[PDB]
Structure 1
Amino acid sequence: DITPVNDETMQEINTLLIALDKTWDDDLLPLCSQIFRRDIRASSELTQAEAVKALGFLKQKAAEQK
């Protein structure tokens, strides 16, 4: 399933990045590229299935400690 990430999922990810003081360019896109073993250069280029995995990881991080 290669449906692109939807706007709702993107907005939840953006929310957590801001709360974590992290960014797509410095933090998340590099990690997504390593985990998904593919060149991911923009937030819009994730699949919805990939974005859901990233979102779960961000939720873990935001839930863990202040």
Structure 2
Amino acid sequence: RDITPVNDETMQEINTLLIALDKTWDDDLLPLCSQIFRRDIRASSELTQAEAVKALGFLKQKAAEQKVAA
């Protein structure tokens, strides 16, 4: 596997969507990534680019599916 770390452009896209979804790395996405990728991920910067692209796909699905309830 390519272990190239996540780049800043992909990170910014992820962050934009987390903010839009009212979700966070600490509460929501890092726990989920840790479960999905079956490794201890403690900071956003520790994702690989390949992992981040999967997470970004998932967040686009969430943001496109439905409105974020108040």
The offset of 1:48, in angstroms, is 0.1
Q: Of the two, which has the highest radius of gyration?
A: 2
The offset of 1:28, in angstroms, is 0.0
Pick the structure with more helix per residue.
1
Percent identical pairs in the alignment equals: 100
After TM superposition, where is structure 1 displaced by more than 4 Å over at least 4 residues in a row?
none
Q: TM-score, normalised by structure 1?
A: 1.00
**CA RMSD in angstroms, aligned pairs only:** 0.1
Aligned positions, number: 66
Give a deviation string over 1:8-48, Cα, whole Å, max 9, x none.
00000000000000000000000000000000000000000
Structure 2 gap segments, 5+ residues each: none
